[PDB]
Short mmCIF file of C-alpha atoms in Angstrom, two decimals:
data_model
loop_
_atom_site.label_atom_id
_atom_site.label_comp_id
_atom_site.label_asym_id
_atom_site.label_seq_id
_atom_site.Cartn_x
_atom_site.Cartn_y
_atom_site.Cartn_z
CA UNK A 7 -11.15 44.60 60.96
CA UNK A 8 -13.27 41.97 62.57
CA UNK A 9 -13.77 44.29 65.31
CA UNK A 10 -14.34 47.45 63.40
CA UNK A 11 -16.87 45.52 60.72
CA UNK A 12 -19.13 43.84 63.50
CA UNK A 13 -19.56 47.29 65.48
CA UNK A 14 -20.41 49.07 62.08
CA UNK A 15 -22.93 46.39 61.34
CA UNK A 16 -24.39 46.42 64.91
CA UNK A 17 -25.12 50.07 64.59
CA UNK A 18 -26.19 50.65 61.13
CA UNK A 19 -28.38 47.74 62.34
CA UNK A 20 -29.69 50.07 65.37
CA UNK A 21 -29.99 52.78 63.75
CA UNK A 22 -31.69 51.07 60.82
CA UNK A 23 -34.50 49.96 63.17
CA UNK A 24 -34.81 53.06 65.28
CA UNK A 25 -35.15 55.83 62.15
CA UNK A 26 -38.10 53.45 60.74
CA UNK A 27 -39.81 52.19 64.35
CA UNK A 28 -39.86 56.33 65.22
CA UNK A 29 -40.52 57.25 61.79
CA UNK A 30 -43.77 54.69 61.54
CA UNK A 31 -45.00 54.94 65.10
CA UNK A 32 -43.48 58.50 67.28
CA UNK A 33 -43.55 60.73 64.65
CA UNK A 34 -46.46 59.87 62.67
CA UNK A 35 -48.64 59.86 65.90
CA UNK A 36 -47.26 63.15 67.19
CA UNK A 37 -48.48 64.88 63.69
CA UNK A 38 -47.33 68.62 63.19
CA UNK A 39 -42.97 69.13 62.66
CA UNK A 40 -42.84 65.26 63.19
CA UNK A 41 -44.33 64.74 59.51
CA UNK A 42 -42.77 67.16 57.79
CA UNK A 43 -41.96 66.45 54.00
CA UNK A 44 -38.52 67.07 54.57
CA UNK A 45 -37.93 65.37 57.81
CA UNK A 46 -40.11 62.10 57.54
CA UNK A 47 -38.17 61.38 54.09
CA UNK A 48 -34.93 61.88 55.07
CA UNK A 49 -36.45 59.63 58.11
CA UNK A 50 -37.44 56.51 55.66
CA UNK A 51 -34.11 57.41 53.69
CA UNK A 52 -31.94 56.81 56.48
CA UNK A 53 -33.36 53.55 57.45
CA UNK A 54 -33.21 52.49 53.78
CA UNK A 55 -29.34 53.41 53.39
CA UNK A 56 -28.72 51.97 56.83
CA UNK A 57 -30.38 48.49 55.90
CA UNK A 58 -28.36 48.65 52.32
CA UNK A 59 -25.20 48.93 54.13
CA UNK A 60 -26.55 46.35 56.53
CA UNK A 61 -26.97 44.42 53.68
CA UNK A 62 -23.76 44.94 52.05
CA UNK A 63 -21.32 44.26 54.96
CA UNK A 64 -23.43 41.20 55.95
CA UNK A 65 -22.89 39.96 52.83
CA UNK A 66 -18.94 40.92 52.54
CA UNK A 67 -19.19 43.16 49.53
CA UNK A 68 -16.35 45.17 48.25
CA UNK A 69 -18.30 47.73 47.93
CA UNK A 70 -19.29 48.83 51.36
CA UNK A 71 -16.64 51.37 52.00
CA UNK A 72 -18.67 53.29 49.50
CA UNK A 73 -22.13 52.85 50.54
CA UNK A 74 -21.26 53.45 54.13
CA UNK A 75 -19.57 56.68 53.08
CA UNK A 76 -23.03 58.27 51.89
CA UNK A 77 -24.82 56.56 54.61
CA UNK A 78 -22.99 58.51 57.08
CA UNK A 79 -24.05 61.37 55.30
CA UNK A 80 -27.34 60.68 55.34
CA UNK A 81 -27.31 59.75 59.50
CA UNK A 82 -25.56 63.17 59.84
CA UNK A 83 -28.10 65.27 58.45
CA UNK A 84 -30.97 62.89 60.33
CA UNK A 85 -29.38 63.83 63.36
CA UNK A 86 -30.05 66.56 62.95
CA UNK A 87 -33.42 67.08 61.81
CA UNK A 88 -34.28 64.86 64.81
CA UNK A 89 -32.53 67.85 66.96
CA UNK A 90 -35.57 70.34 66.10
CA UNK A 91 -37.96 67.05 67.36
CA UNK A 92 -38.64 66.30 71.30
CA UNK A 93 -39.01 62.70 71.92
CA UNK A 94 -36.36 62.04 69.27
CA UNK A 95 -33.28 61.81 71.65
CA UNK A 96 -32.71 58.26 70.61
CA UNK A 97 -32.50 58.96 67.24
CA UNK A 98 -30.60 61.51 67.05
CA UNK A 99 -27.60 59.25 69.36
CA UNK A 100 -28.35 56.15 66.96
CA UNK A 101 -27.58 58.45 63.90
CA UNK A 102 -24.58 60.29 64.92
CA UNK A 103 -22.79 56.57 66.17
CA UNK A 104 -23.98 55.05 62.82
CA UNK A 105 -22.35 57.82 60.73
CA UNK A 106 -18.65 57.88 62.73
CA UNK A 107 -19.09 53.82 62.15
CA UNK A 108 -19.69 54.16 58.69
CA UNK A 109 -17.23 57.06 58.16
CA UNK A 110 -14.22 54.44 59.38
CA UNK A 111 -15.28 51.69 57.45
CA UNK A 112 -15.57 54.14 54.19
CA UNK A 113 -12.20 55.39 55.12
CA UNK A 114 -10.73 51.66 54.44
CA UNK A 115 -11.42 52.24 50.70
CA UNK B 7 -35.11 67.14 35.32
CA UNK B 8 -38.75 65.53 34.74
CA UNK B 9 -37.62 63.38 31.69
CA UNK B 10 -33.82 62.79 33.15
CA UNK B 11 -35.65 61.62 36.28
CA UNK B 12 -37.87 59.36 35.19
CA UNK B 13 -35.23 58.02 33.04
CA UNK B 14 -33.29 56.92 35.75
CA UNK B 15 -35.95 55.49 37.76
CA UNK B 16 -36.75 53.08 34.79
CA UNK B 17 -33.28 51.96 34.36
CA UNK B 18 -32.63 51.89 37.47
CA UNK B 19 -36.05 49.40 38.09
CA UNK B 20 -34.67 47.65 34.86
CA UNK B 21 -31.41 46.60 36.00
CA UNK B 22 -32.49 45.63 39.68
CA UNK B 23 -35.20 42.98 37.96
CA UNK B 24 -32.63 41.70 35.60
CA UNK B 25 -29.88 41.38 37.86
CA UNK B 26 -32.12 39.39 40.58
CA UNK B 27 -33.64 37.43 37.65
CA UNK B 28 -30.83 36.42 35.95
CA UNK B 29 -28.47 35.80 39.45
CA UNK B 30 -31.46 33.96 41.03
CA UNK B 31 -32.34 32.03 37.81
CA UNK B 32 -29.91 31.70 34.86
CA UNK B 33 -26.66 31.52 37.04
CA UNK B 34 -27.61 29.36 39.86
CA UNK B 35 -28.88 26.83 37.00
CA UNK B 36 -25.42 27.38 34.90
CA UNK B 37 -23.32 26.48 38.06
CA UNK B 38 -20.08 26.74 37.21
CA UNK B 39 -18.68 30.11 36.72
CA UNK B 40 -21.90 31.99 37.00
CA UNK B 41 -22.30 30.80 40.96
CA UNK B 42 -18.36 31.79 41.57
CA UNK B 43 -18.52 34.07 45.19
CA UNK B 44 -17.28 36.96 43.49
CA UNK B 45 -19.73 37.13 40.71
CA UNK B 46 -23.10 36.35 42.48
CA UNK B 47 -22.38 38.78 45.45
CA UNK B 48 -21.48 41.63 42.78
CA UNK B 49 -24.74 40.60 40.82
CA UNK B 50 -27.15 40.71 44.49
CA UNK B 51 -25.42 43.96 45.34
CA UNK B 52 -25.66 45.67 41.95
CA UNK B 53 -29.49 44.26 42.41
CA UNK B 54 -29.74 45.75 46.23
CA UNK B 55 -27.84 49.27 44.80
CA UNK B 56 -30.32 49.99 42.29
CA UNK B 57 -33.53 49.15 44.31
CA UNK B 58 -32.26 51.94 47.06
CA UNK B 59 -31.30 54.29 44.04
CA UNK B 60 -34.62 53.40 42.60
CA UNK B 61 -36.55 53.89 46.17
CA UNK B 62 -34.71 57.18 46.78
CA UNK B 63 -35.40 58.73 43.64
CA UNK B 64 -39.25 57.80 44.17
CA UNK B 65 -39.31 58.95 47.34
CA UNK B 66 -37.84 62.48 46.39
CA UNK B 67 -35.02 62.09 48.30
CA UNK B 68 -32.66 65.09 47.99
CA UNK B 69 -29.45 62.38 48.69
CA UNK B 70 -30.49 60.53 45.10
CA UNK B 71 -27.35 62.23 43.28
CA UNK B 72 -25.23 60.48 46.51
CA UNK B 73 -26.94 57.14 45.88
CA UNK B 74 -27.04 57.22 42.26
CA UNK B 75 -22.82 57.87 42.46
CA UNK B 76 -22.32 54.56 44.00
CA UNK B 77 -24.68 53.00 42.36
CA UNK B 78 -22.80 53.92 38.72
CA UNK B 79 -20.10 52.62 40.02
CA UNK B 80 -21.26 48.78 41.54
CA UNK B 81 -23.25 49.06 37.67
CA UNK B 82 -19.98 49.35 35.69
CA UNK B 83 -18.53 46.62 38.28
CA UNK B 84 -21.29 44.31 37.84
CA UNK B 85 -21.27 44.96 33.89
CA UNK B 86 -17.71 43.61 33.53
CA UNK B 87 -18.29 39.85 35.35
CA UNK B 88 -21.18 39.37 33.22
CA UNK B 89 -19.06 40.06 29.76
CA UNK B 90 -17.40 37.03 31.20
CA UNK B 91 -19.79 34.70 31.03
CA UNK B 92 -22.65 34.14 28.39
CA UNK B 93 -26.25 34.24 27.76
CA UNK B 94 -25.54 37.40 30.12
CA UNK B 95 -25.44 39.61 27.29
CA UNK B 96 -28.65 41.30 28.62
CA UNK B 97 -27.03 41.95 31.93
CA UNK B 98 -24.27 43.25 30.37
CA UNK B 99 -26.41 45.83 28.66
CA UNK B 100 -28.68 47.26 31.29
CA UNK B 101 -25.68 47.26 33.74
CA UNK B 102 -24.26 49.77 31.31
CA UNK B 103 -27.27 52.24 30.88
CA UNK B 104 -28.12 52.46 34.26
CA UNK B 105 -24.65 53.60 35.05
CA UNK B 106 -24.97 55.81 32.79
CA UNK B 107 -28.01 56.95 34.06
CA UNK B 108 -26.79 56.96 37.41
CA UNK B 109 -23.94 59.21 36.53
CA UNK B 110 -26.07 62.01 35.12
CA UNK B 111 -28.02 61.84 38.44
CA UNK B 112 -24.71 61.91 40.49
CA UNK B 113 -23.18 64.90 38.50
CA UNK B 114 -26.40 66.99 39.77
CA UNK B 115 -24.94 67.31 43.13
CA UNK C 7 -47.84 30.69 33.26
CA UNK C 8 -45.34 33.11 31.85
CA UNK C 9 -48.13 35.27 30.73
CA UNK C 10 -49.71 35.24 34.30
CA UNK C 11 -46.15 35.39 36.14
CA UNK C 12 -45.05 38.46 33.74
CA UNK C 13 -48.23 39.71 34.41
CA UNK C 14 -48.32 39.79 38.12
CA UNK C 15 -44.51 41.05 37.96
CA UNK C 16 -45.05 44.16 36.44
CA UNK C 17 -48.21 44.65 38.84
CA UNK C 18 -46.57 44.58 41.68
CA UNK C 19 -43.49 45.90 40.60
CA UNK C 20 -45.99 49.57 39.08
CA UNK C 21 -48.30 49.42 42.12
CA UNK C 22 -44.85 49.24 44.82
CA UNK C 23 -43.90 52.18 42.82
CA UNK C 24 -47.02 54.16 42.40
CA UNK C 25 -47.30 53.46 46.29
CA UNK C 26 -43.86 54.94 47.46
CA UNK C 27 -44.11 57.72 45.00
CA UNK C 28 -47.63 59.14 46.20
CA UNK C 29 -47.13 58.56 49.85
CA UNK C 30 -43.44 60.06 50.24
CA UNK C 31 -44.29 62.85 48.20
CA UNK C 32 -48.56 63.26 46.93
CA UNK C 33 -49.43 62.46 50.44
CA UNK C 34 -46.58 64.06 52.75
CA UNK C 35 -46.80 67.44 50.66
CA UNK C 36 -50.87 67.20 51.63
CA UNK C 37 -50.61 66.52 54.98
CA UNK C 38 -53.92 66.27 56.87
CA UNK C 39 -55.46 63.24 56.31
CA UNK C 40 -53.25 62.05 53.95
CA UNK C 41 -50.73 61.89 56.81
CA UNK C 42 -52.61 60.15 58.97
CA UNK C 43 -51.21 57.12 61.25
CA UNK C 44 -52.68 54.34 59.40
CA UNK C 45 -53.37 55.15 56.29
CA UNK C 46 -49.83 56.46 55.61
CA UNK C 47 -48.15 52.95 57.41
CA UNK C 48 -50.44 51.14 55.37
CA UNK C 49 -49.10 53.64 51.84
CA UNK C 50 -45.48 52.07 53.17
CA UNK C 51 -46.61 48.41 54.14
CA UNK C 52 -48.03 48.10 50.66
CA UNK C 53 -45.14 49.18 49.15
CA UNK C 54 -42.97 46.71 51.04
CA UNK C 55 -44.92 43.55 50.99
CA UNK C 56 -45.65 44.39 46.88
CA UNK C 57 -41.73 44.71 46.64
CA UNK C 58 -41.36 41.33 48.13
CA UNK C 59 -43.96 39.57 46.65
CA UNK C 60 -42.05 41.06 43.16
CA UNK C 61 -38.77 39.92 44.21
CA UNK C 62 -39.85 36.18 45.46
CA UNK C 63 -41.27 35.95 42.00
CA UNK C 64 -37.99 37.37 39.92
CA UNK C 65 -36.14 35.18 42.18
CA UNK C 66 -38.53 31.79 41.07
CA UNK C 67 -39.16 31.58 44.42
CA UNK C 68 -41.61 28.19 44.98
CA UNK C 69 -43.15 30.52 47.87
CA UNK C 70 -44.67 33.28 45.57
CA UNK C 71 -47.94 31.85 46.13
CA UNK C 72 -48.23 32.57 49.35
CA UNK C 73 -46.41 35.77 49.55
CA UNK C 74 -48.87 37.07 46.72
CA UNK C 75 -51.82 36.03 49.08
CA UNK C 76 -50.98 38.45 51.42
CA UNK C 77 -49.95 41.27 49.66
CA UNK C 78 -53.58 40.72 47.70
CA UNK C 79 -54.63 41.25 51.17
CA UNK C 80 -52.79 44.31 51.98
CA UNK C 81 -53.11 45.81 48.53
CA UNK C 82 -56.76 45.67 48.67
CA UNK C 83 -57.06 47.22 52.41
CA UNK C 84 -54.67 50.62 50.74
CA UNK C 85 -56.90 50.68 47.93
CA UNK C 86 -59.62 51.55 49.88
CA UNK C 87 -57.48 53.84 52.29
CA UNK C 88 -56.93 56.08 49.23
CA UNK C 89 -60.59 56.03 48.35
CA UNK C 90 -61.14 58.67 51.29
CA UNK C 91 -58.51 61.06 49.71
CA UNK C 92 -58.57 62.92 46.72
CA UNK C 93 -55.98 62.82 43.72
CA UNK C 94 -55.31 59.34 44.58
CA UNK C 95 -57.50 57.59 41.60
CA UNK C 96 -53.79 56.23 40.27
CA UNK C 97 -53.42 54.51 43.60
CA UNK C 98 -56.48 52.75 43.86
CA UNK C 99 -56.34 51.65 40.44
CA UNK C 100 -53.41 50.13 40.95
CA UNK C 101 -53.72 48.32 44.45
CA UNK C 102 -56.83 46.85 42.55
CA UNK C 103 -55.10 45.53 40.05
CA UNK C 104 -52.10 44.21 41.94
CA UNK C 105 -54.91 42.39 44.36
CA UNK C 106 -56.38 40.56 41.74
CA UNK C 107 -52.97 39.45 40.19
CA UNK C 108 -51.56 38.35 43.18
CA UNK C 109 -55.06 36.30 43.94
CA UNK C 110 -54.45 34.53 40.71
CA UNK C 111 -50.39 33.54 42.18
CA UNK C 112 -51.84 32.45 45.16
CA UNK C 113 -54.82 30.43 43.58
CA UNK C 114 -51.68 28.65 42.30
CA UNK C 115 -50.80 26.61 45.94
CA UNK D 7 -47.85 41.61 73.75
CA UNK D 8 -44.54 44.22 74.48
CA UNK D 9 -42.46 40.85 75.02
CA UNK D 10 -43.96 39.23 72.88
CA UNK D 11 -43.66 41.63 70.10
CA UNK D 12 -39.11 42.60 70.55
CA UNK D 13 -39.08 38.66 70.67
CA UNK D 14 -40.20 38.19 67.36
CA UNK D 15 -38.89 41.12 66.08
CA UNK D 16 -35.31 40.14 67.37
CA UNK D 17 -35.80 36.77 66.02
CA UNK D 18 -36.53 37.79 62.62
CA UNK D 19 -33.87 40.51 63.12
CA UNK D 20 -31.31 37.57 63.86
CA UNK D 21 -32.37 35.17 61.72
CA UNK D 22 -32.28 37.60 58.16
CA UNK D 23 -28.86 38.65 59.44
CA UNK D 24 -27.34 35.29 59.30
CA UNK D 25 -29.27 33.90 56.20
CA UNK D 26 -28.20 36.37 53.88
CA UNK D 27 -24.53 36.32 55.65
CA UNK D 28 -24.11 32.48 55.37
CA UNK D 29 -25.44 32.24 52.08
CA UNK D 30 -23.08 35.57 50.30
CA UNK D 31 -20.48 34.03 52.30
CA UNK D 32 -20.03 30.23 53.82
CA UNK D 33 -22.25 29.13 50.99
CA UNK D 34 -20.90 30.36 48.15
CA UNK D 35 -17.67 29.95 49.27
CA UNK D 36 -17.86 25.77 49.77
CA UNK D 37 -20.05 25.50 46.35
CA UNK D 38 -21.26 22.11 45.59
CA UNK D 39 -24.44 21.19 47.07
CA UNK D 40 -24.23 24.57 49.35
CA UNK D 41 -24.85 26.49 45.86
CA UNK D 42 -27.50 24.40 44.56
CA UNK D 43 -30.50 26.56 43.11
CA UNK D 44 -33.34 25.40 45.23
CA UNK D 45 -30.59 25.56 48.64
CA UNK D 46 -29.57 29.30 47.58
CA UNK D 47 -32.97 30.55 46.56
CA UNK D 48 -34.32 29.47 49.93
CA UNK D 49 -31.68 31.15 51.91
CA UNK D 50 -32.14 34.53 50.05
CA UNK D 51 -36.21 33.74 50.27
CA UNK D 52 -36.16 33.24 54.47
CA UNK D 53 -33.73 36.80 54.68
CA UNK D 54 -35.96 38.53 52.52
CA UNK D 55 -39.43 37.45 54.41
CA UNK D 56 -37.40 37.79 57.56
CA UNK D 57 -36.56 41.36 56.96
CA UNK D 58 -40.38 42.23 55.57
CA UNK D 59 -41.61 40.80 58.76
CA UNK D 60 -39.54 42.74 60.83
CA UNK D 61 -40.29 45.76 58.56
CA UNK D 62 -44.09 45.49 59.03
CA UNK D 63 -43.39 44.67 62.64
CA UNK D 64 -41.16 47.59 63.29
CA UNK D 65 -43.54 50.12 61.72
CA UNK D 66 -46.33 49.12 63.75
CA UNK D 67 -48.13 47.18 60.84
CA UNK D 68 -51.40 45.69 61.44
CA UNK D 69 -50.73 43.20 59.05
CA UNK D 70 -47.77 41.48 60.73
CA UNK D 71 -49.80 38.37 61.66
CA UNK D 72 -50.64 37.72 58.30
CA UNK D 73 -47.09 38.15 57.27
CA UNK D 74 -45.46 36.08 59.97
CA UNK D 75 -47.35 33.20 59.13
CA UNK D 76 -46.05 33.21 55.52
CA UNK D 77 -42.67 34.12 57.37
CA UNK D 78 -42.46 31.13 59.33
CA UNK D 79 -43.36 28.88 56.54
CA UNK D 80 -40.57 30.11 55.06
CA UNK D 81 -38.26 29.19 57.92
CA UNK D 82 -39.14 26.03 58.59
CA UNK D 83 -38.50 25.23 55.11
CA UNK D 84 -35.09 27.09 55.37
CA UNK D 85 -34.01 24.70 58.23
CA UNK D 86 -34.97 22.09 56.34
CA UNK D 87 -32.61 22.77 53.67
CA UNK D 88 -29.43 23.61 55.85
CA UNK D 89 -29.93 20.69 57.98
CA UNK D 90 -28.66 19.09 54.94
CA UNK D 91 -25.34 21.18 54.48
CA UNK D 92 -22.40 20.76 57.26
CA UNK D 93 -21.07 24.19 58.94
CA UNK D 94 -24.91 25.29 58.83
CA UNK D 95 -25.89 24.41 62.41
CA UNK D 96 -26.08 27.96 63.02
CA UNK D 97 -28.55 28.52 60.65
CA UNK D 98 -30.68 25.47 61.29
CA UNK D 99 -31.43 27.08 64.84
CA UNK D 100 -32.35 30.51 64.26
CA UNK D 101 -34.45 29.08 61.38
CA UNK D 102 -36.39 27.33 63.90
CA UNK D 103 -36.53 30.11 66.48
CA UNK D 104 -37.85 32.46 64.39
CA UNK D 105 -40.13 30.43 62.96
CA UNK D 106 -41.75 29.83 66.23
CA UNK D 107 -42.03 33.42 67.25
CA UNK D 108 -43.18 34.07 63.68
CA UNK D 109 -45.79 31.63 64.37
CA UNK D 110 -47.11 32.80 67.87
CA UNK D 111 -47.65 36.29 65.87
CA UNK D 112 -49.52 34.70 63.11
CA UNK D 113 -52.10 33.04 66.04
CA UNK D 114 -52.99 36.62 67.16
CA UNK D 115 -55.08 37.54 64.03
#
């Protein structure tokens, strides 16, 4: 559990900071399919879920089972929005480790 | 959808300020009961739950029902500690509505 | 003070709404120059410091002076971002409004 | 500037991480002066600043400066505090850290 909970935090951490540093800076200065309705706010959604369950484990709610299982939801289908992007290959690896991290610690509830 | 939405956003706003407030203010000056781990953790999370239910929802985000589910739930959580101690009557209360709230949002999905 | 602290709560708290709202959805379903690299990070930055500033205040935070100085700052550089665009009268109203609130909080120190 | 910029950014990033974890969990879990209002309000106070800096920081912000400077305020005070409490030697340094990276970004504007 110690294990598990660290690595979960470490990469909803990562992938917290990559969807909104990419979001703010690659995509918005690339224009065109990188600011996309659909795709920039399921960008800023992702990093928001990601920091809440940041948040949560960090401070050892009972809770986070829960909010980790939709944030792995959410990292799924960022993954693969960022798939359609070029440029976006680090998102797309920080959002598909995030979700099977959050998937595990969901599947302790 | 309009009026359901913006219903949700308001209690959802409503709870998050009162369960900072209150947690940050009335608790940490009753000591006591109101500061036991448990209880303040429940009351920052509920707090931290809403705000990302309230930021998804104004964002347009399409996972809101996913959020709002979990958020229902932390709500109902949060309402019971406070019906243990008092002068958290009004915590009680808007725990209670935004679950509600939240629940209608969830059972869109 | 409770009038002014109330008053510069529910500033910050409608103009960090009013800002998410019109730049994840107003602005994104625009595009253009309402998706342009600065005036869309500072739509977000707005949003962010004006959430703080409103939660350093719920919280009693003996800091909310100086938080409020800068998001006066920032809230007063958006509002005349969104002077450029059209449809966003609500935003500049608000960011105005906000600004001058948060001058009064920080007038305080 | 790079350097520069991922040192304060992983300083901040460190530093909110183990405020809010030490105060939701060694704090409240040793009560007595480790709960006390001003104490817990701070700790909360330095996470949240800590994670708005490295928000504004992380989207590219060209307010950051500005921020940081209120951010390390913040910290210094922080340290302060814990330097008091016994267990919190953790804390006490990456209050201090951060605080001086927080600082070096505030001298830019």
């Amino acid at each position: 559990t110690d294990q598990n909970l660290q690595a979960c935090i470490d990469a909803c951490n990562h992938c917290y900071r990559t969807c909104l540093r990419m979001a703010m800076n690659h995509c918005l200065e690339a224009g065109g399919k990188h600011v996309e309705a659909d795709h920039l706010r399921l960008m800023m959604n992702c990093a928001e879920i990601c920091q809440t369950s940041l948040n949560f484990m960090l401070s050892g709610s009972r809770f986070s089972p829960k909010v980790c299982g939709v944030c792995a939801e959410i990292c799924d289908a960022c993954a693969k929005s960022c798939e359609q992007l070029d440029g976006m290959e680090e998102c797309v690896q920080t959002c598909r480790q995030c979700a099977e991290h959050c998937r595990k610690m969901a599947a302790l509830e």
